[PDB]
Structure 1
Amino acid sequence: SKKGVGSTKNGRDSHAKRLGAKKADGQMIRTGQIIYRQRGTRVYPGVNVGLGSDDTLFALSDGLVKYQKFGPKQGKTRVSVVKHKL
């Protein structure tokens, strides 16, 4: 009765890349620090934002973070860092 599948098929698994929304609209950000990490481009660089070509979208200036729709059918979300009032 104890006799089962030997040489079982793929049961392997990778790790989990800790990405997502590290920041959100409503928190002041220091320059240089990360905002969002993503595999691909589901968020696009708008104004005052640095794009490192390792799937990196970080803040390039000071201010407050906002998210706006864009694209054909609001499929794209562009991150913006609006500057503080002067």
Structure 2
Amino acid sequence: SKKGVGSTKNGRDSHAKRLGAKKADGQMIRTGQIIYRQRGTRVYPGVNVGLGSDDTLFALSDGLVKYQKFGPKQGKTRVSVVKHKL
């Protein structure tokens, strides 16, 4: 029958803001195009790339983008961009 069964006490949840992989290797990237969003630092800035105060990775010079693997147990990723060359 009817009964005041309530007491949820929690339904709160924050709006999810998209992040992660926004670009990939093999595409020409003009300067200023954001490549990877993250909360933290899981992709170290390599060469010819810049880091913004949100730790946001972006490019400075044109060229093809590539990822490299390194680290103490080979589990760290670097993003880099090379000039368009043959």
With the length of structure 2 as denominator, give the TM-score of the two structures.
0.90
Deviations 1:10-50 (A, max 9, x none): 11110011112111011110111100000100101000001
Specify whether residues 5 and 65 from structure 1 end up closer, same or farther in structure 2 by C-alpha distance, changes over 3 A only: farther
With the length of structure 1 as denominator, give the TM-score of the two structures.
0.90
2:36 aligns with 36
Helix, strand or coil for the counterpart of 1:15?
A: coil
Percent identity over paired residues: 100
Deviates more, 1:18-27 or 1:4-13: 4-13
Helix, strand or coil for the counterpart of 1:35?
A: strand
Mapped to 1, the partners of 2:27 and 2:2 lie a distance apart of 58
- Give the length in aligned residue pairs: 86
Alignment gaps of 5+ in structure 2: none
Alignment gaps of 5+ in structure 1: none
Mapped to 2, the partners of 1:59 and 1:4 lie a distance apart of 58
Aligned-residue RMSD, C-alpha = 1.4
Helix, strand or coil for the counterpart of 2:61?
A: coil
